[PDB]
Write a protein that binds this ligand. Structure first.
Ligand SMILES: Nc1ncnc2c1ncn2[C@@H]1O[C@H](COP(=O)(O)OP(=O)(O)O)[C@@H](O)[C@H]1O
Ligand SMILES: Nc1ncnc2c1ncn2[C@@H]1O[C@H](COP(=O)(O)OP(=O)(O)O)[C@@H](O)[C@H]1O
Ligand SMILES: OC[C@H]1O[C@H](O)[C@H](O)[C@@H]1O
Ligand SMILES: OC[C@H]1O[C@H](O)[C@H](O)[C@@H]1O
Ligand code: ALF
Ligand code: ALF
Ligand SMILES: [Mg+2]
Ligand SMILES: [Mg+2]
Lengths: 305, 307
C-alpha cells in the first residue's frame, strides 16, 4: 500500500463525565475522570497506524514530560514519529473535556506546542509529503501550515484528505486543493451555510463542496453513518449499531481507518464500511486514543457481521 | 496576642484553568488563550486566605497519595497553616477541577472529588477535641454533607463559632442551617437556599430574613463588585467593596471568607472585618489562579492604609 502522512495536533486529554454542563458561575461534580492522550492529529495517526497503515506523523509536542510520554506511546502505535518535533520552551497541547449524561461534550483547547507547527516545519517535510500517497490533516494546526502542506501535496499528486474539525469557515484557496473532505454535520453546515438534517440536506451541502473543487465529500451523520458523494453522485452508507459509552474520537477513528482502507485499494464503499467498523468499536470504549481499535479487532468485527 | 484558633474543614483541588473568549457550546470546540495549573479547592483556598492574612489556623482535609497531593501539602505548610489535620488517602487521587474562564472573567467549574469524598464523619470525630477547642470552624460544600453536619454539631455543642460558605450552590437541610452562626452565600447561593432571587438591597434583606428565621444570626450575602449585604438578626447594612480592574475572580469569595474570619477572630467589629475582607478579595481579583492570587497580611494592610 502507499504511504500516509498525517499532519496535526497532539493533546493530553482531561475528561470529566458529569450529569449536566455547569451553567456560568456554577460548579458540578462528575462521576468519572480520565487523563488520556488526544488531539485530532494524534488520534487520526493512531487509528491509521493501528488499522495497518504505513504512516508517518508530522506534529509538535512540548519539551515537557507528557510530551516525551506521548511520543514513546505513538511509536508503539505503528507510527513513524521521526517527523514529530519537540518544541523547546513550550508545553504540550491540552484538552479539557466535559461529557454530560446525554453523551454530548464541550471541548476547551490549549494549543501549546501545536501552534508551533509552522509553514517552515512543513517545508522541512516537503520531500516526505511529495513522496506520500496521501496527506491527512485536521484544523487543530495553524491554517497557514495546513495550506502550505496542501499545496506541496497538490504539486506532487499526493492525495489531500481534510477533516475540517474543529468547525470553522475555510478559504476557497484551501478547499480547491482538497481531494477528500470529511465534515460532520455541524462542520458541513459551517462550510456551506446549509444545515444537514436529512439525506437531502447532505446532498445539497456536498454539492457546494463539489463546486468548491472537492471531488469526494463524506458527511458523517453520527449513528446514521455517512453521506458519501463523488462529484454529485452520492448515497448514505449506514454505520453499525452499538451501545455507545464515549464518542470522543469517533470521527478521528473514522478518518484514520478510512485512509488506510483506501490506500489498500479497497473501493470507497468498502473502505467506508471498514471505517464504520473501526469507529463503532471506538464508540464502545473510553478516551480518545485508548478507544482506537487494532486491525485484528476491526477485521474480527467485520467477520462477525 | 494570638487571636482565637481557627479550624478550616474542606476540599483540596488541583485546578486546570483555561482562559477563553466564550464558553464553548454543546458539540463545540474552542481554543483558549491561556492555560494554568494551580492549587485550588474552596477548603484550601479559604485556609490559605486565613493563613496568609494572619490567622492561627489548622486545616482538616484529605489529599490523595499522589505526587500532586504531597506537593499541595508542602505548599500549604508555607502558607502559615497547621496541616497536621490533613490526611493522605491511600489508593485515592487528589481532587481536580477543570475550569473555563471567558472574556468577561466569569467561570464554570467541573469537579473530580477524588480524596475529598473520603473526608468522613469518622475523620471528623477524630478531630473532635481540635474542633471543640477552636474559636471558630469554617466550612464549605465541597466535602460530604454528612461530615459538614457532624463537624457543625461538635462545634455547636462546644460554643465553637460555625461559619459556613454555602458553595457550590445547593439546598441545605434545616438541621444544618440551625447550627450556623455566620453564613456567606453569594447571590445564586442565597436564592438557592431561600428561593428568593437577590438583585438589590431589598431582596438581599428578604433573603437574609429567611436565613435568620432558619436560625442563622449573621448573614452576609456577597454581591460581587457591589460588596456585601451584611445582616445581623434582621438589621442589615450594605458594605461596598473596593474598585479594581478584575483579571480573575476565581477564589474571590474564598479569599473573602478566609480574611473575614481572621478579622473577626482579632475582635474587629463586623463592618471593619468585612472591609478587611473586601480588601483581601479585591487584591485577589486582580491576580490569576486561586491560591496564587491570595494576598498576604502585609499586602492587605498596605492596600487598606492607602485607601
Ligand atoms: N452512535 C454511533 N454508533 C455507531 N457508530 C457511530 C456512532 N456515532 C458515530 N459513529 C461512527 O463514527 C463516525 C463519525 O461520527 P460523527 O459524530 O459524525 O463524527 P465526529 O466524531 O467527528 O463528531 C460515524 O460516521 C460512524 O462511523
Ligand atoms: N469585580 C470585583 N471587584 C472587587 N471585588 C470583588 C469583585 N468580585 C468579587 N469581589 C470580592 O469578593 C467577594 C465575593 O464575590 P462574589 O462574586 O459575590 O462571590 P463568589 O466569588 O463566591 O461568587 C466580594 O464581596 C468582594 O469583596
Ligand atoms: O476529536 C476528539 C479530540 O479533539 C480534541 O483535540 C481532543 O484532544 C480529542 O482527543
Ligand atoms: O472557588 C474557587 C474554587 O472552586 C473549586 O473548588 C475550584 O477548585 C476552585 O479553586
Ligand atoms: F481539487 Al478537485 F475535484 F478534488 F478540483
Ligand atoms: F444558631 Al442561631 F441564631 F445562629 F439560632
Ligand atoms: Mg471511545
Ligand atoms: Mg483572580
Amino acid at each position: 500500500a502507499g504511504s500516509l502522512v498525517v499532519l496535526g495536533s497532539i493533546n493530553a486529554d482531561h475528561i470529566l463525565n458529569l450529569q449536566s454542563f455547569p451553567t456560568p458561575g456554577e460548579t458540578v461534580t462528575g462521576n468519572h475522570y480520565q487523563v488520556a492522550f488526544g488531539g485530532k492529529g494524534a488520534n487520526q495517526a493512531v487509528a491509521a497506524g493501528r488499522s495497518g497503515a504505513n504512516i508517518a506523523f508530522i506534529a509538535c509536542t512540548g519539551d515537557d514530560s507528557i510530551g516525551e510520554s506521548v511520543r514513546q506511546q505513538l511509536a508503539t502505535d505503528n507510527i513513524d514519529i521521526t517527523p514529530v518535533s519537540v518544541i523547546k520552551g513550550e508545553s504540550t497541547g491540552v484538552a479539557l473535556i466535559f461529557v454530560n449524561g446525554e453523551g454530548e461534550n464541550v471541548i476547551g483547547i490549549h494549543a501549546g506546542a501545536n501552534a508551533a507547527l509552522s509553514p517552515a516545519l512543513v517545508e522541512a517535510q516537503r520531500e516526505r509529503i511529495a513522496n506520500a500517497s496521501a496527506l491527512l490533516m485536521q484544523l487543530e494546526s495553524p491554517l497557514e501550515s495546513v495550506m502550505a502542506a496542501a499545496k506541496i501535496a497538490h504539486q506532487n499528486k499526493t492525495i489531500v484528505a481534510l477533516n475540517p474539525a474543529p468547525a470553522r469557515e475555510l478559504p476557497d484557496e484551501l478547499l480547491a486543493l482538497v481531494d477528500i473532505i470529511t465534515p460532520n454535520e455541524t462542520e458541513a453546515e459551517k462550510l456551506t451555510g446549509i444545515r444537514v438534517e436529512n439525506d437531502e440536506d447532505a446532498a445539497k451541502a456536498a454539492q457546494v463542496l463539489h463546486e468548491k473543487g472537492i471531488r469526494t465529500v463524506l458527511i458523517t451523520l453520527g449513528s446514521r453513518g455517512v453521506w458519501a458523494s463523488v462529484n454529485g453522485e452520492g448515497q448514505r452508507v449506514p454505520g453499525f449499531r452499538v451501545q455507545a459509552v464515549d464518542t470522543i474520537a469517533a470521527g478521528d477513528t473514522f478518518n484514520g481507518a478510512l485512509i488506510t482502507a483506501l490506500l489498500e485499494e479497497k473501493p470507497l464503499p468498502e473502505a467506508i464500511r471498514f471505517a464504520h467498523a473501526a469507529a463503532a468499536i471506538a464508540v464502545t470504549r473510553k478516551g480518545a486514543q485508548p478507544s482506537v481499535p487494532w486491525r485484528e479487532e476491526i477485521d474480527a468485527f467485520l467477520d462477525r457481521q
